[PDB]
Coordinates of C-alpha atoms and ligand atoms in Angstrom, one line a residue:
Chain A
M1 CA 121.0 114.7 80.7
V2 CA 121.4 117.5 78.2
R3 CA 118.4 118.5 75.9
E4 CA 117.9 120.8 73.0
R5 CA 118.6 124.5 73.8
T6 CA 117.4 127.8 72.2
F7 CA 118.3 131.4 72.5
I8 CA 115.6 133.7 73.8
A9 CA 116.0 137.5 74.3
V10 CA 113.7 140.1 75.8
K11 CA 114.1 143.0 73.4
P12 CA 114.5 146.6 74.7
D13 CA 110.7 147.3 74.3
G14 CA 110.1 144.2 76.4
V15 CA 112.4 145.6 79.2
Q16 CA 111.0 149.1 78.9
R17 CA 107.4 147.9 79.2
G18 CA 108.0 145.7 82.2
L19 CA 107.4 142.4 80.5
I20 CA 110.5 140.5 81.7
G21 CA 108.9 138.6 84.5
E22 CA 105.8 137.8 82.5
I23 CA 107.9 136.3 79.6
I24 CA 110.2 134.2 82.0
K25 CA 107.1 133.1 83.9
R26 CA 105.6 131.7 80.7
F27 CA 108.6 129.6 80.0
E28 CA 108.9 128.2 83.6
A29 CA 105.2 127.4 83.5
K30 CA 105.6 125.5 80.2
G31 CA 108.2 123.3 82.0
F32 CA 111.3 124.5 80.2
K33 CA 114.6 124.9 82.1
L34 CA 116.6 128.1 82.4
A35 CA 120.3 127.3 81.4
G36 CA 121.6 130.8 81.0
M37 CA 120.7 134.3 81.6
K38 CA 122.4 137.6 81.4
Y39 CA 121.4 141.3 81.2
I40 CA 123.5 143.5 78.9
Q41 CA 123.4 146.4 76.5
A42 CA 125.1 144.5 73.7
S43 CA 127.2 146.1 71.0
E44 CA 126.0 147.2 67.5
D45 CA 128.7 144.8 66.2
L46 CA 127.3 141.9 68.2
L47 CA 123.8 142.5 66.9
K48 CA 125.0 142.9 63.3
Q49 CA 126.3 139.4 63.6
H50 CA 123.2 138.2 65.4
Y51 CA 121.0 139.3 62.5
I52 CA 123.5 138.5 59.7
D53 CA 121.0 136.8 57.4
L54 CA 119.0 140.1 57.2
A55 CA 122.0 142.3 56.6
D56 CA 120.7 143.2 53.1
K57 CA 117.1 144.1 54.3
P58 CA 116.2 147.8 54.4
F59 CA 115.1 147.6 58.1
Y60 CA 118.4 145.9 59.1
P61 CA 120.4 148.9 60.1
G62 CA 117.7 150.5 62.2
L63 CA 117.1 147.1 63.7
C64 CA 120.7 146.6 64.7
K65 CA 121.2 150.0 66.3
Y66 CA 117.8 149.7 68.1
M67 CA 118.6 146.3 69.5
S68 CA 121.8 147.8 70.9
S69 CA 120.3 151.0 72.2
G70 CA 119.2 149.5 75.5
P71 CA 119.6 146.5 77.9
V72 CA 118.2 143.1 76.8
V73 CA 117.7 140.0 78.8
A74 CA 119.7 137.2 77.1
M75 CA 118.5 133.7 77.8
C76 CA 119.2 130.1 77.0
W77 CA 116.2 127.7 77.6
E78 CA 116.4 123.9 77.5
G79 CA 113.9 121.2 76.8
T80 CA 112.6 118.8 74.2
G81 CA 111.8 120.8 71.0
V82 CA 112.4 124.0 72.8
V83 CA 113.4 125.8 69.6
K84 CA 110.2 125.3 67.6
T85 CA 108.0 125.3 70.7
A86 CA 109.4 128.7 71.9
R87 CA 108.5 130.1 68.5
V88 CA 104.9 128.9 68.9
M89 CA 104.8 130.6 72.3
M90 CA 106.1 133.8 70.8
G91 CA 103.6 133.9 68.0
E92 CA 104.6 135.1 64.5
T93 CA 107.3 137.7 63.5
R94 CA 104.4 140.2 63.2
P95 CA 102.3 140.7 66.2
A96 CA 99.4 141.4 63.9
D97 CA 99.7 137.8 62.7
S98 CA 100.1 136.4 66.3
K99 CA 97.3 134.7 68.1
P100 CA 95.9 135.7 71.5
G101 CA 97.6 133.5 74.0
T102 CA 101.0 134.0 72.5
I103 CA 103.5 136.6 73.9
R104 CA 103.5 138.9 70.8
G105 CA 99.8 138.3 70.4
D106 CA 98.9 139.4 74.0
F107 CA 101.4 142.3 74.4
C108 CA 102.5 144.2 71.2
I109 CA 101.3 145.6 67.9
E110 CA 104.2 146.3 65.3
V111 CA 106.8 144.1 63.7
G112 CA 109.6 146.4 64.8
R113 CA 108.5 146.4 68.4
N114 CA 107.8 142.7 68.9
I115 CA 109.4 142.5 72.4
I116 CA 111.0 139.1 72.1
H117 CA 113.4 137.1 70.0
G118 CA 113.8 133.4 69.6
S119 CA 116.1 131.2 67.5
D120 CA 114.3 129.8 64.4
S121 CA 116.3 126.6 64.2
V122 CA 118.6 124.3 66.1
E123 CA 121.3 125.6 63.8
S124 CA 120.5 129.3 64.4
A125 CA 120.2 128.5 68.1
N126 CA 123.6 126.9 68.5
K127 CA 125.2 130.0 66.8
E128 CA 123.2 132.5 68.8
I129 CA 123.9 130.8 72.1
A130 CA 127.6 130.7 71.3
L131 CA 127.5 134.4 70.3
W132 CA 125.8 135.7 73.5
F133 CA 127.1 133.3 76.1
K134 CA 130.6 132.0 77.1
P135 CA 130.5 128.2 77.7
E136 CA 131.0 128.9 81.4
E137 CA 127.8 131.0 81.7
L138 CA 125.7 128.0 80.8
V139 CA 124.6 126.2 84.0
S140 CA 124.2 122.5 84.3
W141 CA 121.6 121.4 86.8
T142 CA 118.7 119.1 87.4
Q143 CA 115.1 120.4 87.9
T144 CA 113.5 118.0 90.4
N145 CA 110.1 118.3 88.7
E146 CA 111.7 116.9 85.6
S147 CA 110.2 113.5 86.2
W148 CA 106.8 115.0 85.9
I149 CA 107.6 116.8 82.7
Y150 CA 109.4 113.9 81.0
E151 CA 108.6 110.2 80.9
Chain B
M1 CA 68.0 122.3 84.3
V2 CA 70.2 119.3 83.5
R3 CA 72.9 119.9 80.8
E4 CA 75.6 117.8 79.1
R5 CA 78.3 116.4 81.3
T6 CA 81.9 115.4 80.8
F7 CA 84.6 113.8 82.9
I8 CA 87.8 115.8 83.6
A9 CA 90.8 114.6 85.6
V10 CA 93.9 116.4 86.7
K11 CA 96.6 113.8 86.1
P12 CA 99.3 112.9 88.7
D13 CA 101.8 115.4 86.9
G14 CA 99.1 118.1 87.2
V15 CA 98.8 117.5 90.9
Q16 CA 102.6 117.3 91.5
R17 CA 103.2 120.6 89.6
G18 CA 100.5 122.5 91.5
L19 CA 98.1 123.0 88.7
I20 CA 94.8 121.9 90.3
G21 CA 93.5 125.4 91.1
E22 CA 94.7 126.8 87.8
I23 CA 92.9 124.1 85.9
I24 CA 89.6 124.4 87.8
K25 CA 89.8 128.2 87.6
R26 CA 89.8 128.0 83.8
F27 CA 86.6 125.9 83.9
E28 CA 84.9 128.3 86.4
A29 CA 85.8 131.4 84.3
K30 CA 84.5 129.7 81.1
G31 CA 81.1 129.4 82.8
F32 CA 80.9 125.7 83.4
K33 CA 79.2 124.3 86.5
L34 CA 81.1 121.8 88.7
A35 CA 78.9 118.7 89.3
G36 CA 81.3 116.3 91.0
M37 CA 84.8 116.2 92.5
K38 CA 86.9 113.8 94.4
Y39 CA 90.6 113.3 95.1
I40 CA 92.0 109.8 95.0
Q41 CA 94.9 107.6 94.0
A42 CA 92.9 105.2 91.9
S43 CA 93.8 101.5 91.4
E44 CA 95.8 100.5 88.3
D45 CA 92.8 98.4 87.4
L46 CA 90.4 101.3 87.6
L47 CA 92.7 103.0 85.1
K48 CA 92.8 99.9 82.9
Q49 CA 89.1 100.2 82.5
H50 CA 89.3 104.0 82.1
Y51 CA 91.6 103.4 79.1
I52 CA 90.2 100.0 78.1
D53 CA 89.9 101.1 74.4
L54 CA 93.7 101.5 74.5
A55 CA 94.5 98.0 75.8
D56 CA 96.3 97.0 72.6
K57 CA 98.6 100.1 72.4
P58 CA 102.2 99.5 73.5
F59 CA 102.1 102.5 75.9
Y60 CA 98.9 101.2 77.7
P61 CA 100.3 99.3 80.7
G62 CA 102.8 102.0 81.5
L63 CA 100.0 104.6 81.1
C64 CA 97.8 102.8 83.5
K65 CA 100.6 102.4 86.1
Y66 CA 101.6 106.0 85.8
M67 CA 98.0 107.2 86.1
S68 CA 97.6 105.2 89.3
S69 CA 101.0 106.0 90.8
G70 CA 99.9 109.2 92.5
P71 CA 96.7 111.1 93.5
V72 CA 94.4 112.6 90.8
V73 CA 91.5 115.1 91.0
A74 CA 88.5 113.5 89.3
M75 CA 85.8 115.9 88.2
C76 CA 82.5 116.1 86.4
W77 CA 81.7 119.3 84.6
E78 CA 78.3 120.4 83.3
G79 CA 77.2 122.8 80.6
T80 CA 76.1 123.2 76.9
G81 CA 78.7 121.5 74.6
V82 CA 81.0 120.8 77.5
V83 CA 82.6 117.6 76.2
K84 CA 84.0 119.1 73.0
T85 CA 84.7 122.5 74.5
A86 CA 86.7 121.0 77.3
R87 CA 88.8 119.3 74.6
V88 CA 89.4 122.6 72.9
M89 CA 90.4 124.1 76.3
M90 CA 92.9 121.2 76.9
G91 CA 94.5 121.3 73.5
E92 CA 95.6 118.3 71.6
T93 CA 96.7 114.9 72.9
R94 CA 100.2 116.0 72.2
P95 CA 101.2 119.2 74.0
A96 CA 103.5 119.8 71.0
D97 CA 100.4 120.3 68.9
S98 CA 98.5 122.3 71.6
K99 CA 98.2 126.1 71.1
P100 CA 99.2 128.7 73.6
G101 CA 96.1 129.5 75.6
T102 CA 95.2 125.9 76.0
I103 CA 96.0 124.0 79.2
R104 CA 98.5 121.6 77.6
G105 CA 99.8 124.4 75.4
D106 CA 100.7 126.6 78.3
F107 CA 101.9 124.0 80.9
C108 CA 103.4 120.9 79.4
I109 CA 105.7 119.4 76.7
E110 CA 105.5 115.6 76.3
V111 CA 102.6 113.4 75.3
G112 CA 103.0 111.1 78.3
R113 CA 103.0 114.0 80.7
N114 CA 100.0 116.1 79.5
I115 CA 98.6 117.0 83.0
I116 CA 94.9 116.7 82.2
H117 CA 92.3 114.2 80.9
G118 CA 89.0 114.9 79.2
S119 CA 86.3 112.7 77.7
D120 CA 86.4 112.6 73.9
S121 CA 82.7 112.1 73.4
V122 CA 79.4 112.2 75.3
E123 CA 79.3 108.4 75.2
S124 CA 82.9 108.1 76.6
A125 CA 81.9 110.8 79.1
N126 CA 78.9 108.7 80.3
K127 CA 81.1 105.7 80.8
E128 CA 83.9 107.6 82.5
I129 CA 81.6 109.4 85.0
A130 CA 79.9 106.2 86.0
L131 CA 83.3 104.6 86.5
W132 CA 84.8 107.4 88.7
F133 CA 81.6 108.6 90.4
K134 CA 78.8 107.1 92.4
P135 CA 75.4 108.6 91.3
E136 CA 75.0 110.2 94.8
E137 CA 78.3 112.1 94.3
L138 CA 77.0 114.2 91.4
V139 CA 75.5 117.3 92.8
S140 CA 72.4 118.9 91.6
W141 CA 72.4 122.7 92.2
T142 CA 71.7 126.0 90.4
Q143 CA 74.5 128.5 89.7
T144 CA 72.8 131.9 89.9
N145 CA 75.0 133.6 87.3
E146 CA 73.5 131.0 84.8
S147 CA 71.1 133.6 83.4
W148 CA 74.2 135.6 82.3
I149 CA 75.8 132.6 80.6
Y150 CA 72.7 131.1 79.0
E151 CA 70.1 133.0 77.0
Chain C
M1 CA 100.3 160.6 65.5
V2 CA 96.6 159.9 65.1
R3 CA 95.7 156.2 64.6
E4 CA 92.8 154.1 63.8
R5 CA 90.0 153.8 66.4
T6 CA 87.3 151.3 67.2
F7 CA 84.3 151.0 69.5
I8 CA 84.4 148.2 72.1
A9 CA 81.6 147.6 74.6
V10 CA 81.4 145.4 77.7
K11 CA 77.9 143.9 77.4
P12 CA 75.5 143.5 80.3
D13 CA 76.6 139.9 80.9
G14 CA 80.2 141.1 81.1
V15 CA 79.3 143.8 83.7
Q16 CA 77.2 141.3 85.7
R17 CA 79.9 138.7 85.7
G18 CA 82.6 141.1 86.9
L19 CA 84.8 141.0 83.8
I20 CA 85.1 144.8 83.1
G21 CA 88.6 145.0 84.6
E22 CA 89.8 141.8 82.9
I23 CA 88.7 143.0 79.5
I24 CA 90.2 146.5 79.9
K25 CA 93.4 145.0 81.2
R26 CA 93.7 142.8 78.1
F27 CA 93.6 145.9 75.9
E28 CA 96.1 147.9 78.0
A29 CA 98.4 144.9 77.9
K30 CA 98.3 144.7 74.1
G31 CA 99.4 148.4 73.9
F32 CA 96.2 150.1 72.7
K33 CA 95.3 153.5 73.9
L34 CA 92.0 154.4 75.6
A35 CA 90.4 157.4 74.0
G36 CA 87.0 157.2 75.5
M37 CA 84.9 155.5 78.2
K38 CA 81.5 155.9 79.7
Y39 CA 79.1 153.7 81.7
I40 CA 75.5 153.8 80.8
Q41 CA 72.3 151.9 80.4
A42 CA 71.5 152.9 76.9
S43 CA 68.1 153.3 75.3
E44 CA 66.5 150.6 73.2
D45 CA 66.4 153.2 70.5
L46 CA 70.2 153.8 70.7
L47 CA 70.7 150.1 70.4
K48 CA 68.3 149.7 67.5
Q49 CA 70.6 152.2 65.7
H50 CA 73.8 150.6 67.0
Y51 CA 72.7 147.3 65.4
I52 CA 70.8 148.8 62.4
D53 CA 72.4 146.6 59.7
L54 CA 71.0 143.5 61.6
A55 CA 67.5 144.9 61.5
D56 CA 66.2 141.9 59.5
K57 CA 67.5 139.1 61.8
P58 CA 65.0 137.3 63.9
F59 CA 67.3 137.9 67.0
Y60 CA 67.5 141.6 66.3
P61 CA 64.5 142.6 68.5
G62 CA 65.6 140.4 71.4
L63 CA 69.2 141.7 71.0
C64 CA 68.3 145.4 71.2
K65 CA 66.3 145.1 74.4
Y66 CA 68.8 142.8 76.1
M67 CA 71.6 145.2 75.2
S68 CA 69.5 148.0 76.8
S69 CA 68.3 146.1 79.9
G70 CA 71.4 146.9 81.9
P71 CA 74.5 149.1 82.2
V72 CA 77.3 148.6 79.6
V73 CA 80.8 149.9 79.5
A74 CA 81.2 152.0 76.2
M75 CA 84.8 152.4 75.1
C76 CA 86.9 153.9 72.3
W77 CA 90.3 152.3 71.7
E78 CA 93.1 153.6 69.4
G79 CA 96.0 152.0 67.7
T80 CA 97.3 150.4 64.4
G81 CA 94.8 147.9 63.1
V82 CA 92.8 148.1 66.2
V83 CA 89.5 147.3 64.5
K84 CA 90.5 143.9 63.2
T85 CA 92.9 143.2 66.1
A86 CA 90.2 143.9 68.7
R87 CA 88.0 141.3 66.9
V88 CA 90.8 138.8 67.0
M89 CA 91.3 139.4 70.8
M90 CA 87.5 138.9 71.2
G91 CA 87.4 135.6 69.2
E92 CA 84.6 134.8 66.8
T93 CA 80.9 135.9 67.0
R94 CA 80.1 132.5 68.5
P95 CA 82.0 131.6 71.7
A96 CA 81.7 128.0 70.3
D97 CA 84.0 129.0 67.4
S98 CA 86.4 131.1 69.6
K99 CA 89.8 129.9 70.6
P100 CA 91.3 129.7 74.1
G101 CA 93.2 132.9 74.7
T102 CA 90.4 135.0 73.3
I103 CA 87.9 136.8 75.5
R104 CA 84.9 134.8 74.3
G105 CA 87.0 131.7 74.3
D106 CA 88.1 132.0 77.9
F107 CA 84.8 133.3 79.3
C108 CA 81.6 132.3 77.4
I109 CA 79.5 129.6 75.9
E110 CA 76.5 131.0 74.0
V111 CA 76.2 133.5 71.1
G112 CA 73.6 135.5 72.9
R113 CA 75.8 135.8 75.9
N114 CA 79.2 136.7 74.4
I115 CA 80.1 139.6 76.8
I116 CA 81.8 142.0 74.5
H117 CA 81.1 143.9 71.3
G118 CA 83.6 145.3 68.7
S119 CA 83.2 147.1 65.5
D120 CA 83.7 144.9 62.4
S121 CA 85.2 147.7 60.2
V122 CA 86.8 151.1 60.2
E123 CA 83.5 152.4 58.7
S124 CA 81.2 150.9 61.3
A125 CA 83.6 152.0 64.0
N126 CA 83.4 155.6 62.8
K127 CA 79.6 155.4 63.1
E128 CA 79.5 153.5 66.4
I129 CA 82.0 155.8 68.1
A130 CA 80.0 158.8 66.9
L131 CA 76.8 157.1 68.1
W132 CA 78.0 156.5 71.6
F133 CA 80.4 159.4 72.2
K134 CA 80.2 163.2 71.9
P135 CA 83.3 164.8 70.4
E136 CA 84.0 166.4 73.8
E137 CA 84.0 163.0 75.5
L138 CA 86.9 161.7 73.4
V139 CA 90.3 162.2 74.8
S140 CA 93.3 162.8 72.6
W141 CA 96.6 162.2 74.4
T142 CA 100.1 160.8 74.2
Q143 CA 101.0 157.6 76.1
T144 CA 104.7 157.8 77.0
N145 CA 105.5 154.2 76.2
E146 CA 104.1 154.8 72.7
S147 CA 107.6 155.0 71.4
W148 CA 108.3 151.4 72.5
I149 CA 105.1 150.2 70.9
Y150 CA 105.5 152.0 67.5
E151 CA 108.6 152.7 65.4
Ligands
DAT201 N1 109.4 143.8 57.5 C1 110.1 144.2 58.7 N2 110.0 145.5 58.8 C2 110.6 146.1 59.9 N3 111.2 145.4 60.8 C3 111.3 144.0 60.7 C4 110.7 143.4 59.6 N4 110.9 142.1 59.8 C5 111.6 141.9 60.9 N5 111.8 143.1 61.5 C6 112.5 142.8 62.7 C7 111.8 142.3 63.7 C8 112.3 140.8 63.8 O1 112.2 140.4 65.1 C9 113.7 140.9 63.4 C10 114.2 139.6 62.9 O2 113.4 139.2 61.8 P1 113.1 137.7 61.4 O3 114.3 136.8 61.9 O4 112.9 137.5 60.0 O5 111.9 137.2 62.2 P2 111.9 136.7 63.7 O6 112.2 137.8 64.7 O7 110.5 136.1 64.0 O8 112.9 135.6 63.7 O9 113.7 141.8 62.5
DAT202 N1 102.3 107.8 71.7 C1 102.0 107.9 73.1 N2 103.1 107.6 73.8 C2 103.0 107.6 75.1 N3 101.8 107.9 75.8 C3 100.7 108.2 75.1 C4 100.8 108.2 73.7 N4 99.6 108.5 73.2 C5 98.7 108.7 74.3 N5 99.5 108.5 75.4 C6 98.7 108.8 76.6 C7 98.5 110.1 76.8 C8 97.0 110.4 76.6 O1 96.5 111.4 77.2 C9 96.4 109.0 77.1 C10 95.0 108.8 76.4 O2 95.1 108.5 75.1 P1 94.0 109.2 74.2 O3 92.6 108.8 74.6 O4 94.3 108.8 72.8 O5 94.3 110.7 74.2 P2 93.5 111.9 74.9 O6 94.1 112.1 76.4 O7 93.7 113.1 74.1 O8 92.0 111.6 75.0 O9 97.2 108.2 76.5
DAT203 N1 72.3 133.6 65.6 C1 72.3 134.5 66.6 N2 71.5 134.2 67.6 C2 71.3 134.9 68.7 N3 72.0 136.0 68.9 C3 72.9 136.4 68.0 C4 73.1 135.6 66.9 N4 74.0 136.3 66.1 C5 74.5 137.3 66.8 N5 73.8 137.4 68.0 C6 74.2 138.6 68.8 C7 75.4 138.4 69.2 C8 76.3 139.3 68.4 O1 77.5 139.7 69.1 C9 75.4 140.5 68.1 C10 75.9 141.2 66.8 O2 76.0 140.2 65.7 P1 77.1 140.4 64.6 O3 77.2 141.8 64.2 O4 76.6 139.6 63.4 O5 78.5 139.8 65.1 P2 79.6 140.4 66.0 O6 79.1 140.7 67.4 O7 80.7 139.3 66.1 O8 80.2 141.7 65.3 O9 74.2 139.9 67.9
MG204 MG1 115.0 134.4 62.3
MG205 MG1 90.6 109.6 76.0
MG206 MG1 78.6 143.6 64.5

């Protein structure tokens, strides 16, 4: 059975600071299922589309070039309420506003270096997933512990 | 030398997902003293009594069967304000409402699979402990680091 | 280049309970920079000054001798908003009011045994750092991952 999916990316500061495993570990631990993962240095043009709603923000151009300046881990995670719950796990947009226990709360300080991205809605998630993954790159499989995560 | 006591159980999903040590470790780190522990697959009826106050809820009979379907770690933990603090450490009834940093927040998703139980009051704690433990099974001992936990 | 600094101390219960590495590790993970560290058993007189604004509290005299009864780790940490953020990472003054994920939240129970100290303002931090460290003992240096922590 297919459940809600979200797009999660480890940003270049996340890769650079050796936080990839730690982030993935947190999601496995939570009980969510990895459905897609790739490792790329995406194009400025891809990122511009990824962040289209902020295109008019002053930090937008720096943001888009920066997010394309190095490799990122692109992920798709699956599970009930994974979009909003992933956000909670991340913390807030600004690390300064993120609680200890969250990923941004434990590991970073500034809004422009906040190591992780997550879709903010099912609508954004469906678009971001389609943007970063070809349908074939999404793997359908059954986690055997599923019966201990879901009634 | 005797302090407040609460009943904590690692539920069958907690056991299945290999979270026993992780749960106990959090209680040791916090500074609480272990007073009783056993490992059983309890009878459906023991669970019916454990959750007697929920007998009229629609999820109750299923709850009781699930909670008796596999082994659980039954514990009694001791220390100042341990009943309510354990609740804080667990999170909310619903993992969806539990914060990162809490046990349900970090490890589970669904209300019916929330890996851990904790007494909600001293009075419930007194009843749950007597139900799961024989008086002889509660161990009286002194943790020597106590003087660094308690003024 | 030069950022805000705060004074953090591992208190005698922290040292005694073997939590020094855990605490330091939490600050390294967050991205803050160590500028100073020493390990001393300070004088009652130094502590009376350290806590001078609390001079009228009934717990003040007990506090100053306890904080001088054993070795503490004295530290200076540097980074954007490190005064307030360090406080957040600690939790609240009372471990009872501190959330899971914070240092007091994960590790302590009583207000008098809350293992860590942190300056409550840039002003107090400037005084406490100056109280505990000689200008020569403060290290000014550049962490090479700094460019992934700060725009
Ligand atoms: N005020 C700001 N100044 C500089 N960079 C910012 C910024 N706000 C956001 N950025 C960066 C960091 C964010 O991860 C990225 C996307 O912003 P967002 O979508 O509004 O928040 P979020 O990443 O939590 O979804 O833009
Ligand atoms: N709406 C619900 N649907 C399915 N199972 C539920 C449920 N609400 C509670 N359960 C289960 C999970 C709870 O841990 C267990 C005990 O109920 P409770 O006493 O109200 O909560 P708690 O475990 O927080 O003390 O009952
Ligand atoms: N009511 C109280 N009873 C006993 N000890 C207390 C106390 N309040 C504070 N202490 C101790 C623990 C505190 O960390 C220390 C300093 O007090 P504080 O400056 O008011 O708060 P904080 O340590 O959070 O900056 O004094
Ligand atoms: Mg967004
Ligand atoms: Mg209950
Ligand atoms: Mg103070």
